[PDB]
Design a protein around this nucleic acid. Structure first.
Lengths: 430, 185, 124, 262
RNA sequence: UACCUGGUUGAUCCUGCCAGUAGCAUAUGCUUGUCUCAAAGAUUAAGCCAUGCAUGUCUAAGUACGCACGGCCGGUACAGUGAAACUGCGAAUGGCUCAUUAAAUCAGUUAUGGUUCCUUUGGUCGCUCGACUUGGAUAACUGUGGUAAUUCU
RNA sequence: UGGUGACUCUAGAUAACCUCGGGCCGAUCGCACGCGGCGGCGACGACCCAUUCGAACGUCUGCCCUAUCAACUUUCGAUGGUAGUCGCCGUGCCUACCAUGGUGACCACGGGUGACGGGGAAUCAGGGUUCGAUUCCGGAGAGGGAGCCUGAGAAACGGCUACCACAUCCAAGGAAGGCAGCAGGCGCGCAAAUU
RNA sequence: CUUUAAAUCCUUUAACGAGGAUCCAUUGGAGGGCAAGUCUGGUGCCAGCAGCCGCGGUAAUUCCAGCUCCAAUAGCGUAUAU
RNA sequence: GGGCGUGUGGCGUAGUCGGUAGCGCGCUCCCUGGGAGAGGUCUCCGGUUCGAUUCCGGACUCGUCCACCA
């Protein structure tokens, strides 16, 4: 089977390094290509980023040493064909982190074990807490915590147990069940305990997590991934990029959130409003008979220009609607001021990136009990929960949370953060 | 090398002067009296008259007793008498020149429906061709430009499948009957 | 009330069958399917309906006449001997290959690259 | 052409095959043999188009290897064999024998011959070849190299071969008073008697031949093929007997048959 | 259907061109109900090409020790299919394009007594004055390898 | 002996020759098998003679514009005589030796061609004018030219060997390429389809 | 059902299926050449029209609109070739 | 989509120690010239702040260029 995994975590926690090295040991990349990246990285004074260079393809990413856009790579496990979605750990690029997490079925939270790094990551200003919250808010119910950089602390057990304890209390407040989350001590740089059990941690007997089939045990991070698809739902493949290949034509690229895409299917592009036939579906330069949930495919479309469709657009089956307005329950997290009617921030629903206006603040409810406190409040502040009517600036496709969960959850952003996250209750379809 | 026809012949000829009053009237008298659909089929029938008249004219330039004039002459007069254009009593090659444009206009099937009196109108006669309401020799003809021959003149009649003939009643009667018993209980 | 007659009946001592041109008279109703033609021709010659292979039908305008042509055999062994392979499957008694023509060639010249016994091993 | 061709077009094929130009792009290329590609008749045409035994060419493929076809003594398996002039095609399972004689036009007439007439064939010699030991030879029109002939067989004599042995029985002199088969050109398909020989030093000679009903004509000797003595042939003739009445009378004859039947 | 009309002048007869008029293609514009047919990267670039594909082939009857199947009647070779490989034959046809070329190509006409010619067909092939069947390679296959890499070995 | 319009044709006789990179003269195969030994259907294999398939060269006649192209061809073959070589063959095809011819006011030679030729298409009273890259025949060529192998048949290109242009992968040592084939892509464009 | 290798379309058969049969035919013109308003208002040698001749300088038969009308009719205009 | 800018009246444009919202054409009115007058979502909200077009953040709008060969 195929599964998607998004790597999230605080900046410099070793996300790209752990991911690039995991892909290497799984045979996803040949040794000579790694040796090339190691030389190029050394020439820029960054020899300690040879594995991150696997994911960082943009010049701006290699120059700053931080991940900016989403990188899609593959490798196989004894049970699944995994597609990793390396998400940026910097605040300015949380938008790309949301469109990448709304895809993944599972999330690997990279936490640095070094002294000072962990505290900075779980701080009120750390992204470790914001990422896990966004992951759970976007649909990712399965979580894997990888305590990276265990080599800097000489694989100290008390330090690992400390990180596991605090992380458990945190993820529990977010909504996750600490018992269903495996904690794996690793070293993204040395490659310790990633695919093979490390000898530097003789105290570590392995992780254990509760599943619907019982208790599963393991030791490595690869085994944690093996211990991890809405194919029955309408097709929803938003675009990440749009390519113009000579001889082939226009080839949009993206990941399949729900449903299945196949050659010959009549698809519709929203908000563009363009319907055409899919000629072929490819996955890493190999043609497929079909793209199921999870596959980051590149499909060729007929009679459609690269100017008619762009990044942010959502593709779907034309035979199996748009949104004029939708009421949704939102929770203000961090907003330095007040949220009044007219406020038009950007909402990240599944992989759609549209600016929606807080048309009307219907009700203000208590975040814990859900009981209504005030009708038609003048404004909202950090900590408040409320039922708000939204109106997208551009055509957008959303569904009720109760009917289609993957398309019913979204994120609100502004003033340096994710000011709110919510679930759609009802939708007024066009 | 692909096996197909690529043989085209235009069945009509547009006139040289397009905007003179004299020729404009005559064809208007031919459309309205014979129920035609455009001016093209006026010149189309005028084109096939120009084919036969020229084929008759050059036969006169060949002198008499010539077998080619004797064969192709008698071959041409064989078809003119079999389609009800020229009578047996005027079977000779000199008479083709005096044959006029309205002469073929009787032998359109549409006129024969207003000639045999089974159409209220010559313009109603074409619709009986269009709606597959009449047949000739147990063969329905959905085209009015069928050139009826002299032999099938007595075989023109309503089709077998026709409400106006011996067939099923039409949709209007099947619709005026469903409320004729559905409104009465 | 569909009555079938004969046209152009001649023997095939060279082909171990008989061939005659089918004429149909179906007034008021549709072109009758080829299955019901066989048993009607079977009782018209008092022979077995399984070797009656009619095809090539063509209606005349307005209906009432459709014109086809078929072949009736001597026995079923010749009916499997001298016949285009598709006419067997038109009854649904023979199953042909299920391989797409491109899939035949894309494998075929891929056996031109490797010399040896591995020609049968490259495919799947 | 960097060598010999292998194909033939449906439009460039000879018209006496009477090939529908709408069915296929190509024509069945006649294999090389005892008769040229012009005056041959490939066996696929004889089965599918003249007698309608088979409907497609692959339905001739199953029947040709059924070994039922006997062209002039031999059983051929190639459908593209050039069955030329007076090749006796006998078919066993019907017991039916056939022979190619021209019509009044240029085409080949579908003629059933009697079994007592199917065992022998007339052939025109091409040259008197002298073999390597003072051994006289002859090549017929169908490429039959016959050794030790009757020495009175000259260049334009016709000889009567038995197919069961491949040997001569009697010969017919090129002399005035003999029946003739005009084979080639505008007079292809006429049967008449020899009237006069016109000599030509250097070019092709011509002989004038009068038809039986006085329709006298001429044709060069290349198309001339004598078949009989006096007024009697040595083979069975199809209807019309090669007289070539003008198109005035075929129209009368055609209407006469439909007015007598109704 | 061998057909003209307007424009020099104050007006006239003329020379006389210009412009209309009817075709036939190529593009293009507006519009578009049915149905049968059917041209379609020639003009500029005989300019440049990704991918894929268009030339292979076995009969009772050239060479079968791949169990890869498979029969048992088995020890007198092989049931028989049979991949591979060897041999034989085709790949010189067909398709595409029109750059060159102005008695050249080509067309009609003939000449080859100035020439070769696979196959087919038909003749030959005990005509010569000395084996109951001769020799040794080699592919497939078994087995060890190279080179980043090829329809390399 | 026999033929042609005319042979140095064919056959015959003779006197010899039999090319070591050699002219043939079964050192095959299968199904039925019946009478020590004799057979049947064939398959296949060849050398030679015809046959067909062609090609190759010749004969005669036929081409578009142009004189601001009137003289050209020529010992670097131009037209011939002689004798060879080469070639499958005739012949300046080439080589030798002699002769001085060969073409042109009947338009040669030269240039242009937005020129593949022809059947043909469009237009027309009659006469013509224009078109014909385009399915039929034939020619010519597969980036540009040159050279060859194999085979009956190629100066072959979905066969090789060079140079020239363009262009692909590399581990930098090398290797490989030819859509004016079916589609398709860019470019060129006023202009032309589905990998 | 038929068609065909398998289809598609054509033809065949049942069911529905138009009253302004709103299931709504355009393209060019309306001074002459050349079939077709001395219609109406705006425009005022301006914008523009028209292949040609020619029209516009305030009552435009030639511009722009509407109404009407004319030719051809699923076609027609325009460009360029002949 | 990565980096840079541009947005303030009908037009295009100023400007702003953070405090008054402009000029020019335009439309209005007055005697091409001059005068007065109408005319603003300072892209947007949220704060910072005694007072925000400015100060901050955010995305936005358009223009710009680097990327982008399933």
């Amino acid at each position: 089977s195929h599964i998607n995994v998004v790597v999230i975590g605080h900046v410099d926690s070793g996300k790209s390094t752990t991911t690039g090295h995991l892909i290497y040991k799984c045979g996803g990349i040949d040794k000579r290509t790694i040796e090339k990246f190691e030389k190029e990285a050394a020439e820029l004074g960054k020899g300690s980023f040879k594995y991150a260079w696997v994911l960082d393809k943009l010049k701006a990413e290699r120059e700053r040493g931080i991940t900016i856009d989403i990188a899609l790579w593959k490798f196989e496990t004894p049970k699944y064909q995994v597609t990793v979605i390396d998400a940026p750990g910097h605040r300015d690029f949380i938008k790309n982190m949301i469109t990448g997490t709304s895809q993944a079925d599972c999330a690997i939270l990279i936490i640095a074990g070094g002294v000072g790094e962990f505290e900075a990551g779980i701080s009120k200003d750390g992204q470790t807490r914001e990422h896990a919250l966004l992951a759970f808010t976007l649909g990712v119910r399965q979580l894997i915590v990888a305590v990276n950089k265990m080599d800097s602390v000489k694989w100290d057990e008390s330090r690992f147990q400390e990180i596991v304890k605090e992380t458990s209390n945190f993820i529990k407040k977010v909504g996750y069940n600490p018992k269903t989350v495996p904690f794996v001590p690793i070293s993204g740089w040395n490659g310790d305990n990633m695919i093979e059990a490390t000898t530097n941690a003789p105290w570590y007997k392995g992780w254990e997590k509760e599943t619907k089939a019982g208790v599963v045990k393991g030791k490595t991070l690869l085994e944690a991934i093996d211990a991890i698809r809405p194919t029955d739902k309408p097709l929803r493949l938003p675009l990440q990029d749009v390519y113009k290949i000579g001889g082939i034509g226009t080839v949009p690229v993206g990941r399949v959130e729900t449903g299945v895409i196949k050659p010959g299917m009549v698809v519709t592009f929203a908000p563009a409003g363009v319907t055409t036939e899919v000629k072929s579906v490819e996955m890493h330069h190999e043609q497929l008979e079909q793209g199921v949930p999870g596959d980051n495919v590149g499909f060729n479309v007929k009679n459609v220009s690269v100017k008619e469709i762009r990044r942010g657009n959502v593709c779907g089956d034309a035979k199996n609607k748009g949104c004029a307005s939708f009421n949704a329950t939102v929770i203000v997290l961090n907003h330095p001021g007040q949220i009044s009617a007219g406020y038009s921030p950007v909402l990240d629903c599944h992989t759609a990136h549209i600016a929606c206006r807080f048309d009307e603040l219907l009700e203000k409810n208590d975040r814990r009990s859900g009981k209504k406190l005030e009708d038609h409040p003048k404004f909202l502040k950090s900590g408040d929960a409320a039922l708000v009517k939204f109106v997208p600036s551009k055509p957008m496709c959303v569904e009720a949370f109760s009917e289609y969960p993957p398309l019913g959850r979204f994120a609100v952003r502004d003033m340096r953060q994710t000011v709110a996250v919510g679930v759609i209750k009802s939708v007024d379809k066009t | 090398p692909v096996a197909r026809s690529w043989v085209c012949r235009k069945t009509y000829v547009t006139p040289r002067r397009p905007f003179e009053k004299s020729r404009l009237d005559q064809e208007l008298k031919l459309i309205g009296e014979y129920g035609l659909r455009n001016k093209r089929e006026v010149w189309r029938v005028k084109f096939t008259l120009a084919k036969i008249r020229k084929a008759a004219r050059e036969l006169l330039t060949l002198d008499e007793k010539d077998p080619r004039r004797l064969f192709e002459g008698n071959a041409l007069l064989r078809r003119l008498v079999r389609i009800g254009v020229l009578d047996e009593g005027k079977m000779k090659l000199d008479y083709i020149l005096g044959l006029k444009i309205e002469d073929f206009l009787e032998r359109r099937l549409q006129t024969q429906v207003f000639k045999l009196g089974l159409a209220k109108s010559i313009h109603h006669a074409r619709v009986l061709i269009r709606q597959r309401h009449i047949r000739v020799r147990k063969q329905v003809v959905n085209i009015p430009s069928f050139i009826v021959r002299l032999d099938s003149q007595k075989h023109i009649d309503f089709s077998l499948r026709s409400p106006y003939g011996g067939g099923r009643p039409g949709r209007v009667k099947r619709k005026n009957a469903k409320k004729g018993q559905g409104g009465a209980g | 009330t569909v009555t079938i007659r004969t046209r152009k009946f001649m023997t095939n001592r060279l082909l171990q069958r008989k061939q005659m041109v089918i004429d149909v008279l179906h007034p008021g109703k549709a072109t009758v399917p080829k299955t019901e033609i066989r048993e009607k021709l079977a009782k018209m010659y008092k022979t077995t309906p399984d070797v009656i292979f009619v095809f090539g039908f063509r209606t005349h305008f307005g209906g009432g006449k459709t014109t086809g042509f078929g072949m009736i055999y001597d026995s079923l062994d010749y009916a499997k001997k001298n016949e285009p392979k598709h006419r067997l499957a038109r009854h649904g008694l023979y199953e042909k290959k299920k391989t797409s023509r491109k899939q035949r060639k894309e494998r075929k010249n891929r056996m031109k690259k490797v010399r040896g016994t591995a020609k049968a091993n490259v495919g799947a | 052409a960097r060598g010999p061709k292998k194909h033939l077009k449906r439009v460039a094929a000879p018209k006496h095959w009477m090939l529908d130009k709408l069915t296929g792009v190509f024509a069945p290329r006649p294999s090389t043999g005892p008769h040229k590609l012009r005056e041959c008749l490939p066996l696929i045409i004889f089965l599918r188009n003249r007698l309608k035994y088979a409907l497609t060419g692959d339905e001739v493929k199953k029947i040709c290897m059924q070994r039922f076809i006997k062209i002039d003594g031999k059983v051929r398996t190639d459908i593209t064999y050039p069955a030329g002039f007076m090749d006796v095609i006998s078919i066993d399972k019907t017991g039916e024998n056939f022979r190619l004689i021209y019509d009044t036009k240029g085409r080949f007439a579908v003629h059933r011959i009697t079994p007592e007439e199917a065992k022998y064939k007339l052939c025109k010699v091409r040259k008197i070849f002298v073999g390597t030991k003072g051994i006289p030879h002859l090549v017929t029109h169908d490429a039959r190299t016959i050794r030790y002939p009757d020495p009175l067989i000259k260049v334009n004599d016709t000889i009567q071969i038995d197919l069961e042995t491949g040997k001569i029985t009697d010969f017919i002199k090129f002399d005035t008073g003999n029946l003739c088969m005009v084979t080639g050109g505008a007079n292809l398909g006429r049967i008449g008697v020899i009237t006069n020989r016109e000599r030509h030093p250097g070019s092709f000679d011509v002989v004038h031949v009068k038809d039986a009903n006085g329709n006298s004509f001429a044709t060069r000797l290349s198309n001339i093929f004598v078949i009989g003595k006096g007024n009697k042939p040595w083979i069975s003739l199809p209807r019309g007997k090669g007289i070539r009445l003008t198109i005035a009378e075929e129209r009368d004859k055609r209407l006469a048959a439909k007015q007598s039947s109704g």
